[PDB]
Design a protein around this ligand. Sequence first.
Ligand SMILES: Nc1ncnc2c1ncn2[C@@H]1O[C@H](COP(=O)(O)OP(=O)(O)O)[C@@H](O)[C@H]1O
Ligand SMILES: Nc1ncnc2c1ncn2[C@@H]1O[C@H](COP(=O)(O)OP(=O)(O)O)[C@@H](O)[C@H]1O
Ligand code: BEF
Ligand code: BEF
Lengths: 269, 335
Amino acid sequence: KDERSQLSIVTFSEQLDQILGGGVPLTKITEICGAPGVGKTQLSMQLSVDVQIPKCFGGVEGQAIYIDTEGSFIVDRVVDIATATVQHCQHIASIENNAEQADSMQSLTMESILEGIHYFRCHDYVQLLALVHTLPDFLKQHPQICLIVVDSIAFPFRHHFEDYALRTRLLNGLAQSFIKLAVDFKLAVLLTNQMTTKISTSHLIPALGESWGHSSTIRLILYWQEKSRYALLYKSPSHKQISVPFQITTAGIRDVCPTSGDLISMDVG
Amino acid sequence: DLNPRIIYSIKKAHLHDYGTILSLSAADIQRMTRLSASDVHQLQKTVAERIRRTPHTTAFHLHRRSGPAELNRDHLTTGCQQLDSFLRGGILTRTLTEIAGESASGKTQLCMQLCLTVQLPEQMGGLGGGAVYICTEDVFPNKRLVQMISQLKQRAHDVKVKDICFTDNIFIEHAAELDDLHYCVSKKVPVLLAQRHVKLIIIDSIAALFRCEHDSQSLQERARLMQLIASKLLQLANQFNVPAICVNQVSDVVEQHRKVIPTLGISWANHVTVRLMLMRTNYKLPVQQKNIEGDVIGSLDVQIRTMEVLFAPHLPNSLCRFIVDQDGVKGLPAK
Ligand SMILES: Nc1ncnc2c1ncn2[C@@H]1O[C@H](COP(=O)(O)OP(=O)(O)O)[C@@H](O)[C@H]1O
Ligand SMILES: Nc1ncnc2c1ncn2[C@@H]1O[C@H](COP(=O)(O)OP(=O)(O)O)[C@@H](O)[C@H]1O
Ligand code: BEF
Ligand code: BEF
């Protein structure tokens, strides 16, 4: 309805922003799946930075919540991405020569970007439910928050749950909780997910079973092909099935060439 | 647990574990007890607030580093400045670092070197504590360790390092089978972390114990024991602020029918924070042998080896050369 509910968070890869519909959409759930090292945490860090891009540079100019359940949030890496994002905005302000942009760069620093990343560390799945349930009290106090990252949603639930049906309603309780948070506070919910195998040539599938992923609007699979990273659009409202190449540099998520990359694939129909 | 008045329904409702409460909906609470959304909301609010959890902070605090102390990590030096910069500081605490590599690639040498550097004072890049080395394969190479210790004391020009008794603070355990390794990690190691100030956990090798069972009932059991051992390792690393390092044989010839693939599969990989791979090359480096009071006498060849970052949250997929000599593992300047 309002103009905030239709905004999107850029990934700094335009090829990625295409298949996402302009970026990671607010008020929806976006899911990132992939083998280790493919870039789930890299994309999570990038979005936590990109959501803070000021509106005079075309950004949402919000803040981020980073819920880290694996412990792979090394702040020295975020400094890399934050530095590069500020340098990119500084470049725009210099090319476009607008006075408001030059004013934004006065307060747009790597440190301010770090200050816009609210960080929560969960060690077990019980701490995650306790945090999600106390989030409304926190978000009402920080209404400028436009992004919630859970990195990852899968890791706390890989234990030997004796009642997998209990794990299922645990995951669906969270999926309903994140959908409600996404609409009620008009922020993007980014969930990262691990891959697992299936025996009954073994192949990889997203974790948490077939009961998981229904409440996710967009689902991406990051994967390697030769020595190149790719993002397969697994689930989307457009129903199209696309793969786009991207890369991960010291600056963060970027397009592989400026510019290059396109495939087609689809489903019935 | 908190107030007894709302309790009259949940004690009678067969649900007194704090974790189980937070799963179901407020209307489902009304389904189980004759309570209102006013009570169902306040019931789950107090439970969620009761659960102890590390408090909120910002990335800026992590950078400063002025948030909760249990979120700070420390760097353990590799002993070489060149490898330390390649790792942006060295081995990180509260992480699981996997060191994979082919046979005689230097995996054991590197781990033994960290058993020395962990004992250095923090000003020198150490963590000021001992190490536990869990062996599943060969006998520990004590002759090689004593050589490295002597070379370290000889080359250190500070009495603070010379007066360290390295052998007394390196605790060698042998785990013959997968179940025994789980006992050692879950029961033996925490004693060392608490009572003897061990600041480094090494397992060499977790993959070797996956030798030959091949019973699916065991294979479910083999994978069940992996998750438990890997989860316990991560839990100890965070709780005691120590690095956990697992050595793994990279299984080359079957997967690649010079390219390589680590052994334990994707379920194991999902626990690894940083995975490095060591390989041998055919190239050799001429180095002058000079000893101490005697002088440079001639050149000998050392094997040139590679170290590669397969994945890490903060490192590029870079490669770096290194060698092994009397002192241990030494990096080579780029490039
Ligand atoms: N400082 C850096 N410079 C360049 N690339 C990096 C840097 N840090 C990490 N990367 C890339 O990102 C990868 C880590 O991705 P990550 O998101 O942690 O994986 P996962 O999807 O398992 O979370 C590394 O393997 C590396 O290729
Ligand atoms: N004192 C030394 N000087 C030079 N090279 C050594 C020394 N000790 C061992 N090496 C080399 O290290 C390799 C063995 O390394 P090791 O730690 O056993 O690796 P891995 O555990 O992967 O077999 C051998 O190739 C050997 O040539
Ligand atoms: F660091 Be990634 F989320 F595996
Ligand atoms: F000595 Be090595 F770990 F094979």
